Structure 1
């Protein structure tokens, strides 16, 4: 039994290749992805959904985003920047960040990979609960831009968690594997992998010859994703409430939240239909807010962000010394790639060229990891 694990920044995912087919494995809640969250309690440690569910009751002992810290030094430009947005404690133990928290009231700290080993303990347990078997062998993926210390601290997270990490495979390599792009026969193939999720955007160009992979270049935007689209809708609807009602909801956190949640869900609806309706009873000062949004209105709100996903693409082609003409395959990953407009901006950058998208873009990486781990086991 060998699993592939996508150890994602916000969400993780585990698959098992069994019976000629990869099965993406649901957790104890039925969710095919699991939040990369651990919470620290008066009684208990919570991992996954349980932990995300209570990032209000206990936000100081609730840790996420430990992939942004893993393998990095305390003075890394990135550990400094993201730090300001983390209610949890990031201390400096000998130049390398440990996360500090309270757990059964005794104070406790962890390096990013003890915390990531916890997430991987959940992902192992998720698989064992499904298979009714011990699971030890795994492929774990990482971003292509990970350095030696980032790969090794990841590997170690797996090992602490009790995993025999068969291999650390790059995220865009695992998604290429998912689509069996490496079983193609002929000359050398250039692959563009477009990965836009909830919070990050990563572009990767690989070459594949004779089933052998090489990363040519890497670009993206560390803080562009689906959340930024949700904001554009929220401001659009806050302005609408102001126009119809002369009330400013924006200082009411619970209204803003109700609106945001309905915005993100409306956005999803808009990936497969051309209009989304919202009814929120009693949103602000007892005033109901019933509204709808077209797909084109959504796109218009987001027009500069969408187009702009193309700048990392051109940066990536340049750095790889390819013209857009020399790309044989384009692979979509991350749940935001579901937006028809993004698919169309990209599929018209590559002059009418189509796209590997048939695999759930949130599950493609774990899918390829699982195929890999079965080959390796």
Structure 2
């Protein structure tokens, strides 16, 4: 299992290297890869940086920000706004889904988002060397089943089985190590990403027995930070250039795009230094030749352009508390996600509000992928839960007198499940039993798979039929099989624990179905002998004592005749012959008319 972080703007993939988190890097040498897919006009399907690097050249067939659309329907508040702003041809699907039209062909966005996952899968495979067939994947907290399944569908289309699908706040909490080692923590997750903002206030409780990861309150914004802020700076840089160099840029789409990317980088520096220089060679050209742009910007000029939108990240931070009914002191940890959370101004303004400095002790364009890795790796490794009734192949049971499998857990029942049956000793003055744990579907125990065996010794000198030996089969929720046997007279228990990976594999399971379905006639022909052998054993044993109870009440001829037939039954019961046993039981029973009158 690999940990994929599927973002809005940017994608990152990770694994657990033993116990240690490892964050991987693409063939181009990038870690956090852009979640951009572009169908080049002459047919090439590009992903990532080579999808951004041509994005000006073929925008109508450039797909970005698909997490907004992934599993929403044509009439929705996001899709209706996306259709108003997004350059690529969004359409209504034939089911009313929000779909894309590219180069004239209609496609379902799990198919599109798969090209991120196929690149991430390749990126992961390229480090490991072995083919990967499994994933864990991220989502926001406020996504419904259709949006959660759409991401799992995107996984399946990539040949990645989605072995869990986890939330971005859970991933954030896991990433900074909040799996264990407190009784309770109340966390604030501040996600100020590439092109979205989320606040999720979440509770991690261990006091219900080391299990709850719950979302208490979430809020967020659609067009926050960034676009209305960087626009104050873009416009200053335009008006400074218009002033200094006597030419406009709002007319130039390329200069706007380059000014956007350049100034957005500069803004991120100026919250971490006093100054940086907005240098742009060959920005625009006119009758006086080219214009080279070099504008000096400071935090001080910046701070006086940008009085607004960080506060718009402290405003929903109020509702997320007001709806929950908690105070800033009740929160243990304020934890950061998203690449804008390297800008001092948000780190400062979050600290100022919460009072305790936010944690960024794991890199916040990777952490949310480490949150996938730490679940995917050692955890979903193995571990956890759910409930009962039916599914879910082969039967589990034990060997009983006859050499027959007696079934405790039936074929096609789910986990966890607890069932039991009461057994006994087979001989008089028998002080112990073997418990042989069978997996299979055949009658004859020697034809089923021996999972294990154990003993229960120390049964008191009782007569047979009487010692109440309970055998209990318990299958836990990790699939681990626990078999327990107990004497109810003394209370002396013995156990065995058998792994979910013990016993028969898929092909052995298929054989067993073919084996048990084909040999049904042969197995019944045995089961119908086991029944007769056991009836004969009861009669042989009881009629021996019905003589010993009778004594001098029983005449010599009867004693002579009955004891003769008792011997012969004890010979026939060393045969595999049913008919001889049924006959010798009759040859015996016929002569026990007077014996039964005495035993009566």
| TM-score normalised over the length of structure 1 | 0.93
Q: Secondary structure at the match of 2:171?
A: helix
The Cα of 1:256 is off from its aligned counterpart by 2.6
The Cα of 1:95 is off from its aligned counterpart by 0.9
Q: Does 1:361 align with 2:364?
A: yes
The Cα of 1:271 is off from its aligned counterpart by 4.1
The Cα of 1:128 is off from its aligned counterpart by 0.5
Q: Does 1:190 align with 2:189?
A: no
Kindly report structure 1 stretches of 4+ aligned residues shifted beyond 4 Å. Answer: none
Q: Secondary structure at the match of 1:5?
A: strand
The Cα of 1:282 is off from its aligned counterpart by 5.0
Q: 2:352 aligns with which of 348, 351, 354?
A: 348
Equivalents in 2 of 1:333, 1:56: separation in Å? 29
Shift of the 282–69 alpha-carbon distance from structure 1 to 2, 3 Å rule, reads closer
What do residues 55-74 of structure 1 show as CA deviations (whole Å, max 9, x unaligned)? 12221221112111112111
The Cα of 1:139 is off from its aligned counterpart by 0.9
**Mapped contact 1:158–1:165 kept (Cα < 8 A):** yes
The Cα of 1:133 is off from its aligned counterpart by 1.4
Q: Does 1:63 align with 2:67?
A: no
Q: Does 1:311 align with 2:312?
A: no
Matches within 5 A, 1:54-203: 54-93=54-93, 94-102=95-103, 107-186=104-183, 188-203=184-199
Equivalents in 2 of 1:242, 1:56: separation in Å? 24
Q: Secondary structure at the match of 2:71?
A: coil
The Cα of 1:85 is off from its aligned counterpart by 1.8
The Cα of 1:75 is off from its aligned counterpart by 0.5
Q: CA RMSD in A?
A: 1.8
Matches within 5 A, 1:213-232: 213-232=213-232
2:306 maps to: 302
Equivalents in 1 of 2:296, 2:56: separation in Å? 30
**Mapped contact 2:225–2:312 kept (Cα < 8 A):** no
Equivalents in 2 of 1:227, 1:126: separation in Å? 31
The Cα of 1:48 is off from its aligned counterpart by 1.9
Aligned length: 370
| Higher deviation after alignment, 282-291 or 139-148 | 282-291
1:16 maps to: 15
2:297 maps to: 293
What do residues 247-301 of structure 1 show as CA deviations (whole Å, max 9, x unaligned)? 3332123333332232122123334322111333454443443222112332332
What do residues 218-243 of structure 1 show as CA deviations (whole Å, max 9, x unaligned)? 11111114344432211111122233
Equivalents in 2 of 1:280, 1:58: separation in Å? 24
| Higher deviation after alignment, 167-176 or 61-70 | 61-70
Shift of the 288–108 alpha-carbon distance from structure 1 to 2, 3 Å rule, reads closer
**Mapped contact 2:73–2:92 kept (Cα < 8 A):** no
The Cα of 1:154 is off from its aligned counterpart by 0.8
**Mapped contact 1:144–1:215 kept (Cα < 8 A):** yes
| TM-score normalised over the length of structure 2 | 0.59
What do residues 295-352 of structure 1 show as CA deviations (whole Å, max 9, x unaligned)? 233233222111221011111111222122211111111000111011111101112x
Shift of the 133–252 alpha-carbon distance from structure 1 to 2, 3 Å rule, reads same
Q: Secondary structure at the match of 1:251?
A: coil
What do residues 158-199 of structure 1 show as CA deviations (whole Å, max 9, x unaligned)? 11211111111100110110111232313x321110011121
Equivalents in 1 of 2:265, 2:346: separation in Å? 18
Higher relative contact order (CA 8 A, sep 6+): 1
1:3 maps to: 2
Q: 1:205 aligns with which of 201, 206, 210?
A: 201
